[PDB]
Hints:
InterPro entries (chain C): Ntn_hydrolases_N, Proteasome_alpha, Proteasome_alpha-type, Proteasome_alpha_type_5, Proteasome_asu_N, Proteasome_sua/b
Protein name (chain C): Proteasome subunit alpha type-5
Number of domains of chain F: 1
Largest sheet of chain B: 5 strands, antiparallel
Distance between the termini of chain F: 61 Å
CATH class of chain B: Alpha Beta
Keywords (chain F): Cytoplasm, Isopeptide bond, Nucleus, Proteasome, Ubl conjugation
Keywords (chain C): Cytoplasm, Nucleus, Phosphoprotein, Proteasome
Structural class of chain F: alpha+beta
Order of helices and strands of chain B: HEEEEHHEEEEHHEHEH
Radius of gyration of chain F: 19 Å
Distance between the termini of chain B: 51 Å
CATH topology of chain B: Glutamine Phosphoribosylpyrophosphate, subunit 1, domain 1
Helix content of chain F: 25-40%
Oligomer: part of a larger assembly
Structural class of chain B: alpha+beta
CATH topology of chain F: Glutamine Phosphoribosylpyrophosphate, subunit 1, domain 1
Main location (chain F): cytoplasm
Helix content of chain B: 25-40%
Strand content of chain B: 25-35%
Number of helices of chain F: 6
Order of helices and strands of chain F: HEEEEHHEEEEHHEEH
Largest interface: D-F, 37 and 43 residues
CATH superfamily of chain B: Aminohydrolase, N-terminal nucleophile (Ntn) domain
Strand order of the largest sheet of chain F: 8-1-2-9-10
Strand order of the largest sheet of chain B: 8-1-2-9-10
Amino acid sequence: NNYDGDTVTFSPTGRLFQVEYALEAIKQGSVTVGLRSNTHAVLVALKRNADELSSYQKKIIKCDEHMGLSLAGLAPDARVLSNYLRQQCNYSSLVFNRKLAVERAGHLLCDKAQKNTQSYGGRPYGVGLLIIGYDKSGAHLLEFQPSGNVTELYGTAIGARSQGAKTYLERTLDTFIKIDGNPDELIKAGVEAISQSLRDESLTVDNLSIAIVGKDTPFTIYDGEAVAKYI
Amino acid sequence: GYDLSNSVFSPDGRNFQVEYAVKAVENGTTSIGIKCNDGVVFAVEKLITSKLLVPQKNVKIQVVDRHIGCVYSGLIPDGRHLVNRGREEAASFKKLYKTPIPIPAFADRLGQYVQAHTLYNSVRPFGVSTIFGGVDKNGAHLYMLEPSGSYWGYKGAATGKGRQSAKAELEKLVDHHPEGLSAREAVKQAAKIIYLAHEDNKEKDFELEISWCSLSETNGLHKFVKGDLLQEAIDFAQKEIN
Amino acid sequence: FLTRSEYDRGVSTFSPEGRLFQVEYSLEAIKLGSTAIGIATKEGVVLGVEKRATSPLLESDSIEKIVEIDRHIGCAMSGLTADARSMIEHARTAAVTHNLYYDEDINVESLTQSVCDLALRFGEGASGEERLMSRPFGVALLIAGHDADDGYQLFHAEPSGTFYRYNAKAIGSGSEGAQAELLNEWHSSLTLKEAELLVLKILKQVMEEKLDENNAQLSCITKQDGFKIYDNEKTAELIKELKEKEAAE
Amino acid sequence: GSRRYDSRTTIFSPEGRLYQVEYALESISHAGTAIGIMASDGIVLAAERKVTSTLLEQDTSTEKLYKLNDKIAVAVAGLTADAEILINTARIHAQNYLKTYNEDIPVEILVRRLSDIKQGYTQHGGLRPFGVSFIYAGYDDRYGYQLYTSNPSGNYTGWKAISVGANTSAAQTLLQMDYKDDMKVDDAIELALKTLSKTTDSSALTYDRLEFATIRKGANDGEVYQKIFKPQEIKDILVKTGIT
Amino acid sequence: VDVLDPALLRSGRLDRKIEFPLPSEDSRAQILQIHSRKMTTDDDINWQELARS
Amino acid sequence: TDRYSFSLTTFSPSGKLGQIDYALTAVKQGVTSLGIKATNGVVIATEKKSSSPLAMSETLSKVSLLTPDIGAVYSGMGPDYRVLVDKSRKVAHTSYKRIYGEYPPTKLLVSEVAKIMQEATQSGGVRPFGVSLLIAGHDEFNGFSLYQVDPSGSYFPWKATAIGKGSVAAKTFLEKRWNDELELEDAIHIALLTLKESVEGEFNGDTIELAIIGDENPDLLGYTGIPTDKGPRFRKLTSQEINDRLEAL
Amino acid sequence: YDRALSIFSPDGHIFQVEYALEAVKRGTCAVGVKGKNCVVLGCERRSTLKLQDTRITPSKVSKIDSHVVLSFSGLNADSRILIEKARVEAQSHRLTLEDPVTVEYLTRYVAGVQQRYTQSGGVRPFGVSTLIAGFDPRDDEPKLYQTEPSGIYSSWSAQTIGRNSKTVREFLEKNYDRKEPPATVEECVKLTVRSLLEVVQTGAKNIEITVVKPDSDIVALSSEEINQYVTQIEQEK
Amino acid sequence: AGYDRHITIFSPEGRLYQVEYAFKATNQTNINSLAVRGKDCTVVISQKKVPDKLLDPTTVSYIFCISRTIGMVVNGPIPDARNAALRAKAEAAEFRYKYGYDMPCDVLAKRMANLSQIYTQRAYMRPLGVILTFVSVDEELGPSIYKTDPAGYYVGYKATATGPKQQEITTNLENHFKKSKIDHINEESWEKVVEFAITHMIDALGTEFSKNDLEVGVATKDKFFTLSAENIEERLVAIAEQ
């Protein structure tokens, strides 16, 4: 502790270490991969059980019938952010009679982290979210960091061993963009994408969690004996 | 201890916190503001981190009102709060006085907000430098706002990593044209010194975004330079540095 | 005491761990918890708790860690039980709220999720909810229940704000010894009196007295009879018929 | 920021004990002595001033002695600023009781109310205590003459003879040997004077350094005359007892 | 290099200031082959596979 | 946010309150002022000081008016005096010229201002004002009165006192110089003579500020034709009147 | 102020609850023993100090309703805030639900009161432990409860809290029987006096005894009475 | 405690070191001013320095118009200058509204003064590190200069200077009014007071000035104006032809 244990301070370097600390939430996080093409988005999250008598705790939350977010990091933080996204999503449906703009909602999120990083006794959130959806401008993948950086990407990951996924996506980048109208392939590309990011943790028919959104297919989360078709 | 916060004082006239905020802005990317005869022309160097990105789909120049361009460097999330605040303050003034806000008025407001964040224990002074301007009916103006809440008029301002390359070249441009230059002619100038400001930043690759607010091109609105006009600027600069 | 803790000056402050320290400490107060065992089957859920005798002058048949939320959901508290005095009221309120608004028996998972949303509300003022706590709760629950939509379910609710659905879980001090045995002896082909007798098997190992109905209590949640607290006369019979079959060895 | 520099002075010690309360008790033996001695016919309150200078005006001063109401007066020993506040809180409470029941307050009730006020400041809010000790002389019909001390923690006990302030241990020993259950007021006045002559923190003990006041049943028709004496009536009764 | 004296920031002392970076994709693959030259391997090795992983 | 509501004045381990011990030292690092109480009047006299000699001194006041019968004079801090004079007046109007429709007696005014100091001793976000005030005034029923309010919040009446840095020496001088009847004419010569032993500075009416709560002046009444009220009993002495008395010492 | 006076400890506690228990240890000793048809709370009073008015000063047994007594050990000053809450709840029960309180409901309330000052910010726990005893109305079962500053409540057959409680607790294992209380009121009083004479000692004037019988009869036995009861025990021993 | 000057708490010496630290931070712009009372005017002259060719010279300013009668000249950092400019404006609207005449300078000295005390009495507010010189021409008190400082102390002046080299100026002003033997120059027109002021400043600071390195503000009767560089240029030639 010199400048390390306080979110209001600075820092001779000009960082602060409290943000870097929150970025370890990503690091201890479980791998999840999102990739989109141009007609369909897919989030592939690797669920994690505590033990054998136990079930797995879902890692994808239906935010809307065209939007979903998946956590990586702390489970209490994620539950705060998911409620908020939903409130602002229903606000737009009510007030402007309108599906929520994906690009805009990323800035609403940003400012909520920012105000707990301005005032003392606040915290930086320890969850980074991948938020996919399909609106009037097509498929989208937003990447949320603890810092509050919002970026739109063709395909990304966060989690433990995120590097190994990201080198996979650099190969298969030009493949997935060009498959369109066949949601099936993009899912297969996502099963393989997270296989690379395993520590021999395997993929079972209740560990792998697929969720998709289309031109014509609402937000849906597959698990059960649905997933086994892709496994 | 007396070197840790903002409400502290130390007998050297230093208030170490605030000076540390400049060090944040010093990690940013180059941003320039070219003050021309007809308006203002901003450009920002936008780092392309990975080939996984979806290109030209992140704007680091955000509009406030319909006539005041705003582009900032330092902490990207932190800056987004400062712009939201100046969009509230613009909207309050637009209602109460039924005109689009003057730029010396927009200056007062923002100026006050960051100054505020050095007088309480429970807040941190924001570490961003803004560059904002446009056309109002008293003419075009440009302001650069330090994280310390310091600002001045400017015929050219910059901030960022490559504020070293950029500044020397802005001297060159007021000695090229000491009677000023056109806002059209200045699109090609913003391309040229953003490209030179990536020789302090050549570990990556980047995308150039250019926007303008000039009276004589855009009817005094804050618009983006886009399509074929934007690629003429890219080519111009690209051939000089080769 | 006085074990290195670099940071812990804020009640939410980081930490090169990547997670808060205060939440971690909250889970280290459940290893001082009086042992609560729970075996969930597809025919019913048994909540057993050691009442815990402290003295011979303490009346240990008057004190119990079986707490009713409603007729279709039961709950068991282990840890710092003063913290559970506040939450268990809240949970009972919650259920009732659902019966007012929707006239329906509340999901076990939903109910579990509600005291978790409560569990996370430590702080000096931040987020959507106004903080009214300042130190995290140091108590874990085993919400059992029965709904007619997803069957028998049993949840382990954390002071963290996390819920993991278990098929059987013991918590408390003798948690480590319990979960070795659950792993081998549990299965999904159990019947109600073979589970019941399993609760008393594992209770026998984490017992710090000896097993008798003057320091141990059983309780069930059954679909057609609801949540029922087993009285001591009934409890006695089963403990003796364990002792008959363990003497057939 | 603020939480960093927070004193936290309202937490328990390892002993279960409240450092600032003790620190308050430590500092009142740096203020002058105030004594109460309960006679059967009245109550003598005898205070020794913690200041004196020949350039002092100590003649309009009632700087230890206060009337809370015409039947219950106090002797104050400690930090005078904190004390002044409670004194007008008490007046406000007396008059409230009087508004609502149209009957004067018993001594039992007003001593419990001041004490609860103190209790709040040591209990929470991160404040420091109000470091004051009051000797309440009062008359009520329900339990008669009643004598009381309260301390900065906010706890009270009744006494037949008490001493507060400077040399508490000392004054207590003396009081126990020269007390008798039933006295006249004069004998009490004498005793009040005598204890302060052996405990005085300067060798000399004088009228201008005594504030001295009684409550006497020398009012006919079963009433009580609160008398705060003039320092020239103190001078005569001090020559009477032969001190000076 | 954060522990050096301000009289070693200066040129005249050590003028040229070289940083050794954490390895790169190409660099890792090379490193592995230089140790493994010393011992005997089988002929079904792929140095890129190990270096991705 | 803010969370400064915790006391910043606390008891010290050795007893006594550190912050008020610090404030009193500060009063003896200031200017020097004294007051003598006469039979038929009261005088206060103090030194006027400024950074540079090219600064004015008529635009500065260290004898200030609370009521037309009551002036105050300080020793301690200039900034801290200025605010409390205003608050002294504000509370004198709101709690006594609205509820009794007249000015308060000197004892009653003293006590009000002693509460304001008191909440600067209690609670967070305050540290004591570092002044000592004299409040000399006249009311009809107790006649002439002289007080001293200190950093701590107690008050004391005195018969003659001084405050400031030259204080210990000044009260010794005034001990032999006090008399049982002193006239106001005589007192004026006394205060000047004492503050001449205490001030090196060029001794004119323009550097020594003199104010008397002597006797009533029907010419400072501001109206005529009312014989019922009488004028200010306070009267600030400007440079010319002091110059005659300079020569008569 | 909204800053914590309760800082979580890595030990699995809160420091201030451990500090609050010591504070209770240093407090005067209370015994509770319930008969078949009585309750008996004996408490030590330090009357060792002389020229103490004892008439006007409240006993360390406070009636909170017409059939529920509360005795206490730990911080005497602090206790009075609990006694003022509890008297207030007792009326509220009659107002809104009708009938007098039950000993259990009141004990639970006290439990939630002391609990609150742990979990809230801006406040430190109370280091005060109560013995709550009494009757339920329409009933004649003595019910004897103990609440402790952890905000944990307990029923007890007999209990003791305060200073050197352990010495009395070992005696109570051995001279009171779980199965059989002493059946006369008088013998129950003498069993508790006999217990008190272990730590209290120093004559019979530091002993005080409150006896409660159902149907709302709280009477406190004077010194004279005690004197006779103590002398009996003295002679027989 | 090791905390003893993080907050505005007395020292063993009975002092507010925290407040003293403000006065060591009133000299960071390193600008100097001198202000003199004529007979029927007030004149205040200050230095102007621009650090670069690339600022606009007009906007760089230290003399801030508060009322239309009260000018205000600022020594010390420009962030706290502005916060001081704003508060003052607020009180000037406020006085007219409730008392039905324009704010007197005298009254602005005490309000802004009492406000300063309130910043050194909260244990969470950091005082403004600006010495304000208030110039006015009043009809009820005549031409006056009031100097407030970060403590909240103030006094009147016959002339005054501020700035780090301000000792030098004190010599010129002391010597000058020693010879005149009166507190104000007997001169009936503002022109020749601008001429006098610049002369003592040339003597004291040891450097002659130019049009673009001056900044002049003048309070006349019933209006407050600032002179531009052109009007200042005229004044300089007429010192030479005396």
